[PDB]
């Protein structure tokens, strides 16, 4: 479907069925935004909303998580999972203080420096936190738009990528594009599934390639071997 279409449904839908209420979502700063992706990288939402609540207790600011000790930091994060995002926390922490006064970067290029920081959750920090005009692609992204606009191939290769990032600029807008971004990350998680999906919960039914042709199997593509 029509790009200006994808953008006004889900838009719409996220009015009326999105998430809004979780605790990075409320006086949202880039140090919340920051800290709430990398531990929902690897971990559902239930679990870390108490991780959350008592990391930014003890730590109000970038600030003070940089000079305390690591082994309190990986104290806290027991339970999590994935500590190699923690030791990574800790040094981004650390890299703020030490290069930017303690202020939470607000430019691209020196967010998508930090350790533990790819081009996509660099996006991500931006564009919630403080509106700025960047798309992002996670898998929860990537499971939509390939089923949507029906991109085979493995994401793992170059050139599929790319299509897929261009794919996500093409769809994502400029006017209110921190509710679009949020909605596309609780679309994948909670109605495009990695297995059966929910089309009739889904805003995207009326064009959805896959939906037509009943192959969401199909997309994204596998690893070949
Ligand atoms: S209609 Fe079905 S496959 Fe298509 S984006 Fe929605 S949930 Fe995914």
């Known amino acids: 479907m029509q790009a200006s279409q994808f953008s006004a449904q889900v838009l719409d839908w996220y009015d009326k069925y999105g998430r809004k209420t979780l605790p990075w979502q409320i006086d949202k700063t880039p140090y919340k935004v920051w800290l709430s992706e990398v531990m ?43 500590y190699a995002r923690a030791r990574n926390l800790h040094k981004a922490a650390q890299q703020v203080a030490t290069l930017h006064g303690g202020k939470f970067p ?22 919630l936190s403080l509106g700025k005009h960047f ?23 170059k050139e599929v990528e790319n299509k897929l990032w261009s794919l996500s600029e093409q769809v994502t807008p400029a006017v209110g594009v921190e509710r679009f971004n949020q909605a596309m990350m609780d679309l994948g998680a909670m109605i495009c599934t ?18 037509a042709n009943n192959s969401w199997a199909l997309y994204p593509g596998k690893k070949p071997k």
């Open 40 to 82: 929902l990288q690897q971990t559902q939402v239930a679990t870390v909303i108490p991780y959350f609540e008592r990391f930014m207790a003890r730590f109000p600011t970038v600030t003070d998580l940089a000079n305390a000790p690591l082994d309190e930091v990986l104290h806290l994060w027991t339970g999590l999972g994935y």
């Open 135 to 157: 798309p992002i692609l996670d898998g929860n992204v990537k499971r939509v738009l390939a089923r949507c606009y029906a991109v085979s191939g493995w994401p793992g290769k």
């Open 106 to 127: 607000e430019t691209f290029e020196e967010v998508a420096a930090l350790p533990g920081v790819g081009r996509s959750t660099a996006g991500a920090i931006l564009s």
């Open 194 to 211: 990695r297995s059966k999906p929910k089309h009739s919960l889904c805003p995207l039914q009326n064009g959805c390639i896959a939906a």
